[PDB]
Amino acid sequence: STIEEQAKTFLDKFNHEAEDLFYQSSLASWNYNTNITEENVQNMNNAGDKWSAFLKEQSTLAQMYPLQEIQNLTVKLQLQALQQNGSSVLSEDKSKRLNTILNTMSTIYSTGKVCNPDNPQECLLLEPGLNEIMANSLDYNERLWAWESWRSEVGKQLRPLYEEYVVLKNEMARANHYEDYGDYWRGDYEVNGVDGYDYSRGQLIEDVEHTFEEIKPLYEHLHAYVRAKLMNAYPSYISPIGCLPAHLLGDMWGRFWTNLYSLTVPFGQKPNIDVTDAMVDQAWDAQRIFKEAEKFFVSVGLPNMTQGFWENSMLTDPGNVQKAVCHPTAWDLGKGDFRILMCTKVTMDDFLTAHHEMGHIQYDMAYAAQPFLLRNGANEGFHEAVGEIMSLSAATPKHLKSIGLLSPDFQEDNETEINFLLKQALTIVGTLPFTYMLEKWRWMVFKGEIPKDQWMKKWWEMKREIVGVVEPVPHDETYCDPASLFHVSNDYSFIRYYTRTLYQFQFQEALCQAAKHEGPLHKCDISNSTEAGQKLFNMLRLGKSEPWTLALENVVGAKNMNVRPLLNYFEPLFTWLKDQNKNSFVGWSTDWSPYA
Amino acid sequence: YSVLYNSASFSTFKCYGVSPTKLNDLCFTNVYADSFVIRGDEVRQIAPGQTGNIADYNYKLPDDFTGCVIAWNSNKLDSKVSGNYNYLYRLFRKSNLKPFERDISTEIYQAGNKPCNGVAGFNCYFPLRSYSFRPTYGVGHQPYRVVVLSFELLHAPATVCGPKKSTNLVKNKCVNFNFNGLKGTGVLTESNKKFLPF
Numbered sequence: 191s192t193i194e195e196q197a198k199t200f201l202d203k204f205n206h207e208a209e210d211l212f213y214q215s216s217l218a219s220w221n222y223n224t225n226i227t228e229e230n231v232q233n234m235n236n237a238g239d240k241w242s243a244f245l246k247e248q249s250t251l252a253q254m255y256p257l258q259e260i261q262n263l264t265v266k267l268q269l270q271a272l273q274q275n276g277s278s279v280l281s282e283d284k285s286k287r288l289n290t291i292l293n294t295m296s297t298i299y300s301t302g303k304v305c306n307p308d309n310p311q312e313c314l315l316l317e318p319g320l321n322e323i324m325a326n327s328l329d330y331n332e333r334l335w336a337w338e339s340w341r342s343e344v345g346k347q348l349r350p351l352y353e354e355y356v357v358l359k360n361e362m363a364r365a366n367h368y369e370d371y372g373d374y375w376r377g378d379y380e381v382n383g384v385d386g387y388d389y390s391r392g393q394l395i396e397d398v399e400h401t402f403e404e405i406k407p408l409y410e411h412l413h414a415y416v417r418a419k420l421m422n423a424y425p426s427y428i429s430p431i432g433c434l435p436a437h438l439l440g441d442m443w444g445r446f447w448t449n450l451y452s453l454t455v456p457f458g459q460k461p462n463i464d465v466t467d468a469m470v471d472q473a474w475d476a477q478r479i480f481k482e483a484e485k486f487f488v489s490v491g492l493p494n495m496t497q498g499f500w501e502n503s504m505l506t507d508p509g510n511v512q513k514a515v516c517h518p519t520a521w522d523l524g525k526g527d528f529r530i531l532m533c534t535k536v537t538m539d540d541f542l543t544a545h546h547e548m549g550h551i552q553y554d555m556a557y558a559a560q561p562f563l564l565r566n567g568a569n570e571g572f573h574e575a576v577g578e579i580m581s582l583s584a585a586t587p588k589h590l591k592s593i594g595l596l597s598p599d600f601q602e603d604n605e606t607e608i609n610f611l612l613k614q615a616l617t618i619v620g621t622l623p624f625t626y627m628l629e630k631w632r633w634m635v636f637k638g639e640i641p642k643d644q645w646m647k648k649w650w651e652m653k654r655e656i657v658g659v660v661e662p663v664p665h666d667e668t669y670c671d672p673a674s675l676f677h678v679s680n681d682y683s684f685i686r687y688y689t690r691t692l693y694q695f696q697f698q699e700a701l702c703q704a705a706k707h708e709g710p711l712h713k714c715d716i717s718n719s720t721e722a723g724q725k726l727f728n729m730l731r732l733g734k735s736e737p738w739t740l741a742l743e744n745v746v747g748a749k750n751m752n753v754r755p756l757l758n759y760f761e762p763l764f765t766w767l768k769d770q771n772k773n774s775f776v777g778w779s780t781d782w783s784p785y786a
Numbered sequence: 787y788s789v790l791y792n793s794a795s796f797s798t799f800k801c802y803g804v805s806p807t808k809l810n811d812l813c814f815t816n817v818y819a820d821s822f823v824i825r826g827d828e829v830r831q832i833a834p835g836q837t838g839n840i841a842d843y844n845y846k847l848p849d850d851f852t853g854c855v856i857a858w859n860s861n862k863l864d865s866k867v868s869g870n871y872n873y874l875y876r877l878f879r880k881s882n883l884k885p886f887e888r889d890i891s892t893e894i895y896q897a898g899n900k901p902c903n904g905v906a907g908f909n910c911y912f913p914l915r916s917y918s919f920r921p922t923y924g925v926g927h928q929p930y931r932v933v934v935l936s937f938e939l940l941h942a943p944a945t946v947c948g949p950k951k952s953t954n955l956v957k958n959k960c961v962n963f964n965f966n967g968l969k970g971t972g973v974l975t976e977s978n979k980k981f982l983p984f
């Protein structure tokens with residue numbers, strides 16, 4: 191027989207043999223993440239041995255089936271995923287330093303100790319330290335204090351290791367012949383061999399800049415808005431036209447702006463929408479929240495849950511002597527086993543999170559008919575683009591009224607809409623520029639444009655001309671601000687946070703026509719439209735058997751990412767922002783400085 | 787055919803070629819029962835004109851099959867904490883099976899172009915493997931006991947003909963009667979003749 195059917199036989203054997211092995215690992219993982227104890231740690235190791243070892247052997251014998259002599263697309267895609275080496279292309283001597291640097295970075299990032307100078311009595315570290323304090327504090331020195339201490343310790347003790355890590359990752363990627371580590375990560379979005387759907391690895395950067403340029407007026411308007419509104423709480427130390435400081439933008443790294451609504455309220459004296467009071471008065475249990483999350487998916491387009499999730503999933507915090515780590519996640523153990531790991535209180539945040547988790551569960555089972563190696567989302571971003579749109583439909587003041595939580599006699603005023611839009615734009619809109627700038631810095635570091643010497647200077651002046659952030663203290667080239675980051679100290683990417691941001695809005699607008707809905711886009715709530723659920727099913731059940739561009743086009747009709755839905759979400763906010771920015775100049779000047 | 791039809795303890799009970807009742811008092815030369823255990827999702831494959839591993843390389847059903855099929859869950863028996871590795875099933879066979887044909891060989895498949903020499907490896911694999919049923923598995927993988935019943939009729943006496951219903955008898959009044967296949971009409975009266983024992 192020819193190589194094609196032999197490869198098919200090996201594929202079938204692998205698909206059968208991986209399932210039972212993965213199930214025990216998943217069971218051990220659920221047991222640990224539900225019940226923490228010393229004796230339930232060998233199982234991890236035990237599982238983390240067996241499965242892991244098996245995996246490497248299935249990459250050892252899988253390279254003798256060349257893809258050139260196969261004419262079926264799906265098995266070609268399968269072989270591409272399983273023919274990758276990983277880190278075994280590196281020799282053992284050079285592989286004993288990569289893992290060493292990873293261990294050092296993880297340990298040092300987890301090990302935090304921030305103390306004030308000349309005061310060895312009190313220290314506060316990471317949590318419940320830095321994040322809690324410098325989000326609600328109106329003291330200049332206190333805000334700039336932990337800001338400088340964390341960078342002076344972690345940056346100093348991780349910059350030399352970062353220098354070695356960059357070149358090591360470049361070498362390990364070049365051993366796999368992509369061009370370098372940058373193309374190594376940018377090849378995740380690769381599709382070849384399909385007409386009208388193929389895509390190149392280098393076009394990602396330019397395509398991202400295209401959607402980046404079509405949001406700059408909004409970013410500049412909100413920049414001037416927040417600067418003018420923080421000129422009130424902080425009387426001075428702010429340029430009339432310039433870069434906002436790095437210690438006045440919510441979190442440490444400025445990547446989240448949720449901590450700025452306290453000082454910046456569009457219309458005051460008006461409480462927002464709160465249904466948690468209704469939840470606590472008439473006393474729903476921990477279940478009915480999930481049952482309503484269940485009945486939403488039941489009603490729209492999707493079948494109801496199986497019996498296994500209702501007797502094998504922990505919903506409420508156990509406390510007691512049995513410890514459980516609260517981290518809401520969706521678990522697909524295999525063999526038709528689905529559960530959710532989370533601890534719930536009576537909160538609206540848990541109400542919104544339950545919809546996200548249920549969407550994740552219904553997404554996992556959607557591609558359960560696909561082979562074992564095709565049981566995943568189209569990329570690393572579509573998976574969060576499926577269950578997150580539920581929070582867009584679970585927060586409208588029509589489904590809450592329908593389920594009996596929000597005051598059926600309420601009148602929705604012109605004042606609350608802009609407040610909600612600013613509140614939820616401080617999270618989604620306010621993180622794209624910094625995140626993509628960080629990714630661009632990583633890409634140019636890995637590609638080779640910037641030598642190791644002019645690293646922070648370029649970083650700090652991109653902090654000025656792109657984000658609009660000024661140094662509270664002039665830093666020298668001895669720190670490493672990126673090294674003190676969660677997904678930079680530990681090996682993870684940042685591109686997934688950008689396309690996802692545009693995916694969640696692109697799909698929604700499609701269903702907004704399928705729901706026959708009229709009104710503003712933010713009020714678009716899908717309900718009683720089996721057609722929208724049918725289209726959702728027509729894209730969830732495919733998975734990795736088809737290119738991601740095809741999956742996107744099946745709903746939105748576009749072979750490339752578009753930003754227009756995001757701005758179509760923000761017409762009232764844009765109008766209101768330009769409504770109260772007519773007395774001060776918009777933009778920033780990258781010449782002002784707190785230190786002059 | 788009464789402890790089967792009336793008892794609603796069966797997930798799947800379907801008769802092809804005959805009705806459950808009505809045709810439950812017609813008889814044939816022989817009855818053949820095939821019993822086995824499969825996974826929850828394979829019970830669909832047991833039908834005439836079906837393709838798949840179970841329908842082809844394990845047991846083939848003829849297109850003109852006449853009989854009945856019963857299939858019911860057995861998760862309370864064939865599920866073990868350590869895994870139910872006892873049940874074996876086949877992947878690697880050179881040709882499809884004929885109806886009512888079985889193969890129980892353990893020949894290593896010569897998938898490649900070189901003799902396997904009886905040892906598994908590259909392009910050489912074991913043909914039979916196990917479910918490993920677990921208590922926490924879903925209905926799509928939970929074990930199901932399946933039995934198929936086939937009726938064979940030939941130029942034979944066909945001596946398996948079901949139960950016969952009977953009614954009480956009255957006397958001294960002419961009626962219709964069916965005495966052991968003898969149809970008649972009239973009065974039945976006590977007698978005193980001497981019939982031979984046969």
Ligand SMILES: *[C@@H]1O[C@H](CO)[C@@H](O)[C@H](O)[C@H]1NC(C)=O
Pocket residue numbers: 225226227228229230512
């Ligand atoms: C959690 O694990 C401990 C082992 O230290 C065990 O004694 C306990 O019964 C477990 N709890 C549950 C709910 O399984």
Ligand SMILES: *[C@@H]1O[C@H](CO)[C@@H](O)[C@H](O)[C@H]1NC(C)=O
Pocket residue numbers: 262263264265
């Ligand atoms: C490619 O492989 C899939 C997987 O079994 C199969 O369904 C499909 O028919 C194959 N392609 C062609 C053209 O037969």
Ligand SMILES: *[C@@H]1O[C@H](CO)[C@@H](O)[C@H](O)[C@H]1NC(C)=O
Pocket residue numbers: 494495496
């Ligand atoms: C799911 O929906 C079906 C209706 O098709 C119903 O018969 C079944 O009881 C439902 N199950 C649950 C757990 O709600």
Ligand SMILES: *[C@@H]1O[C@H](CO)[C@@H](O)[C@H](O)[C@H]1NC(C)=O
Pocket residue numbers: 489588589592593717718
């Ligand atoms: C139809 O929509 C209303 C309001 O959005 C909702 O209360 C109702 O439950 C929906 N219909 C069904 C069958 O869920």
Ligand SMILES: *[C@@H]1O[C@H](CO)[C@@H](O)[C@H](O)[C@H]1NC(C)=O
Pocket residue numbers: 604605608762
């Ligand atoms: C709400 O109505 C008032 C009254 O006309 C109007 O001035 C205001 O602009 C409306 N809200 C928005 C967001 O336009």
Ligand SMILES: [Zn+2]
Pocket residue numbers: 546547550574577578
């Ligand atoms: Zn999620």
